[PDB]
């Protein structure tokens, strides 16, 4: 099995646990904890080919976990992700990839934008919004919720897309 | 690099060394080490290996304490601050505001992650590995008394959620599926109706769905603290692995049972009606990508009784024989062509334990629990980091539930198998194979007819779903 | 280049996978790795003909109870392992032998009777006793410690043997 190190990154109190959990193992998470580094594997077929994800988990609370640089060293693409209900995350995408060029020293590292918690009905960032950011980056985007399971399954499977295009 | 604390008021300030760790030759893997520096490694500052702080918990209770390992955490947690150069000094001495170019430095990047990588080992200690504070109601203590020490607004949400965990723990995961269940499949047996429930009267894919879901239910139990040990094998064998001997026993469950239909249907004609019932079902399984269904009903059409019984396999349909040559392949040449197979999946599965237990089991007997380099003695992790590689093979199979409904009323048919009655293990195996004597006895001694058993009819409605 | 199918067989607390490894260890007790071919295939010369040793040792399985047929079929060859120490386990060799005999369905199987962890006190088995119940089945005996390393080559060669001359 070729082997594709997933980094998970993004502001906190988002869903990055709750969306990596989902996909994980198929059950949503309500609590809500801080997480410092978790990492879950999982083994899926993507386009036909057998691939083991190593999903890490990383932290979002800003100078409260900031080991962030050592995440990013160790990954191959990365998944940013933003709570669509909160504003604040949505502008911190920039940061992040900022943060995540200057560690892998290079400008076209594999990532993808997510918009989670869709199911929730307040909007205060528009799909419009978020893919001309995501368009301006070349990074795709996907538009997921994890408690009804919509989009993070093609969420985590478009940035294995990502990786696999860019290694080659 | 840094000046980190004096090595004698902190002990894992000591400089690596190869009297005490040993690295496998970008994150640094570790082969040995004394107890000392495998605390050390498991909440390092520079890297992030949260595989470490898995694969340690999992497996050190060969040589570490419970008791012992938190004395070693709190230990680790509580850093001391590094001692001022003379410069920092003088305004220390005057009382002049000291500028501390390099402590603001330290305690960024020593204590910030070093502190907060103990709450993540002591975070993930206590939701997974829970079985340590229960047996040992002290431990738990000495966990809360530690919880507590931890003060400063950072660090202050994180023992909201150890403290969080603790207390579900002490008092004690709804799915969503993206796809509806397919519905269920029924044949002769029409719902409801417990009584008349058998091997032909089933449909032969519910019988393989509800057998999917009750051997995954069985396969998802079994935690590692069952297997890290080598205990399922010791004399403690039904207080330490309740869950894995209870899948085990499932297994041979079913394969007597398959074995029991097969050579109690007397008559010809309907035991080859049942034996391809019974392929039927090893197809299904297949696609449900249940090998350890496989392997149960692969081992029923090898054991004694039934393969001697070449009459009643010469009739079975050549697509049916193709399928069970195919599913027997698996098995042969030590797994590797089910090996290969359980790599290249989509999974939900079943595992089978039988190579996770004869691995789990060799691979402790075979390396050393300790190794000496240069005269000391450092604990063999490489040992425990294969074992947890097991552990953590089996783990990556556990997440992913099916897609099935659960049929209460077959599921507590196979529950309530019982195919060695009130006999023993010895005497039903010979039962079983005199029983296959008598119905095909061997050469040159005549096949006698026998009569038909089942009043229903025998056509298999094929593995393919109605929809 | 002849291949051997050898099959180890005995109770659980009889230690069996120390047998194997034993074989398989003859060098260094540094590494060992079961999954990898090498560990239960080991290229040997006996009697001045090479040969090949494919030895299916299925420790911590004994569970499986009715998967014992399945494994005992595939081996050419049989040590029934008993432990000195358990006069339990001599007893149970009957049965593995009977049951060796109903799987490959012929009364001869090439087969050897082995002692193991024979250096230790407490030898509840005598010697005399293993001696005559191998004369009674017509199969060699041999003695093994499972910690020295003394005479499991020479079961495994005497193994090999019988296996031999049963094919003539
Ligand atoms: N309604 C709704 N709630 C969601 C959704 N995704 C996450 N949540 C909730 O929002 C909170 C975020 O939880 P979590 O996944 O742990 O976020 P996090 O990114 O891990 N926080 P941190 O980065 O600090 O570890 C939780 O209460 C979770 O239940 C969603 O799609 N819909
Ligand atoms: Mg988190």
């Known amino acids: 099995m070729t082997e594709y190190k997933l980094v998970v990154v993004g502001a906190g109190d988002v869903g990055k646990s709750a969306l990596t959990i989902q996909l994980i193992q198929n059950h949503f998470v309500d609590e809500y904890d801080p997480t410092i580094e978790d990492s879950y594997r999982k083994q899926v077929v993507i386009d036909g080919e057998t691939c083991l994800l190593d999903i890490l988990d990383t932290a979002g609370q800003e100078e409260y976990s900031a080991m962030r640089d050592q995440y990013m060293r160790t990954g191959e693409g990365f998944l940013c992700v933003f709570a669509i209900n909160n504003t604040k995350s949505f502008e911190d995408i920039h940061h992040y990839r900022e943060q995540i060029k200057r560690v892998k020293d290079s400008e076209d590292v594999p990532m993808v934008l997510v918009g989670n918690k869709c199911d929730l009905p307040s909007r205060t960032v528009d799909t419009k919004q978020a893919q001309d950011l995501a368009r301006s980056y070349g990074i795709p985007f996907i538009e997921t919720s994890a408690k009804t399971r919509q989009g993070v399954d093609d969420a985590f499977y478009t940035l294995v897309r990502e990786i696999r295009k860019h290694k080659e | ?467």
Not at chain 2, 22 to 51: C, Q, S, W
Not at chain 2, 325 to 353: G, M, Q, T
Not at chain 2, 453 to 464: D, E, F, M, Q, T
């Open chain 2, 1 to 467: 690099q840094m000046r980190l604390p004096s090595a004698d008021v902190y002990r894992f300030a000591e400089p690596d060394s190869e009297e005490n760790i040993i690295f496998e030759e970008g994150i640094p893997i570790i082969k040995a080490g004394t107890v000392i520096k495998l605390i050390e490694r498991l909440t390092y500052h520079m890297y992030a290996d949260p595989n470490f702080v898995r694969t340690f918990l999992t497996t050190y209770r060969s040589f570490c304490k419970p008791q012992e390992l938190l004395s070693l955490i709190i230990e680790r947690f509580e850093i001391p601050e590094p001692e001022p150069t003379e410069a920092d000094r003088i305004a220390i001495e005057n009382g002049d505001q000291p500028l501390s170019a390099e402590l603001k430095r330290f305690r960024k990047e020593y204590i910030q992650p070093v502190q907060l990588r103990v709450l993540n080992v002591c975070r993930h200690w206590v939701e997974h590995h829970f079985y340590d504070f229960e047996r040992d109601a002290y431990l738990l203590q000495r966990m809360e008394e530690f919880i507590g020490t931890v003060r400063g607004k950072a660090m202050k949400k994180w023992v909201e959620s150890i403290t969080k965990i603790i207390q579900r723990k002490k008092i004690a995961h709804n799915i969503t599926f993206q796809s509806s269940p397919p519905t269920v499949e029924w044949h002769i047996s029409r719902p409801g109706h417990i009584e008349t429930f058998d091997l032909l009267t089933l449909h032969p894919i519910e019988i393989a769905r509800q057998l999917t879901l009750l051997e995954s239910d069985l396969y998802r139990a079994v935690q590692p603290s069952e297997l890290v040990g080598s205990v399922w094998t010791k004399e403690d064998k039904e207080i330490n692995s309740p869950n894995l001997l209870k899948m085990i026993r499932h297994t041979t469950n079913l394969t007597l049972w398959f074995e029991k239909c097969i050579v109690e249907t007397e008559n010809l004609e309907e035991r080859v009606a049942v034996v391809s019932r019974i392929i039927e079902i090893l197809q299904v399984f297949q696609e449900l990508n249940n090998f350890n269904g496989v392997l149960e009903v692969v081992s029923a059409m090898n054991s004694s009784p039934v393969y001697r019984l070449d009459h009643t396999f010469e009739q079975i349909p050549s697509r049916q024989k193709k399928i069970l040559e195919e599913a027997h392949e698996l098995s042969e040449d030590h797994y590797k062509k089910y090996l290969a197979k359980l790599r290249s999946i989509n999974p939900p599965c079943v595992p089978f334990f039988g190579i996770y237990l004869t691995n789990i089991l060799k691979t402790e007997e075979g390396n050393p629990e300790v190794l000496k380099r240069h005269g000391k003695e450092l604990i063999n992790f490489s040992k425990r980091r294969k074992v947890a590689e097991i552990t953590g093979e089996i783990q990556q199979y556990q997440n992913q539930p099916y897609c099935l409904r659960v049929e209460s009323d077959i599921k507590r048919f196979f529950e309530n198998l019982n195919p060695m009655g009130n006999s023993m293990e010895k005497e039903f195996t010979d039962y079983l194979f005199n029983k296959s004597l008598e119905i095909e006895p061997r050469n040159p001694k005549p096949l006698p007819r026998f009569p038909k058993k089942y009043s229903y009819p025998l056509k298999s409605p094929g593995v393919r779903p109605s929809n």
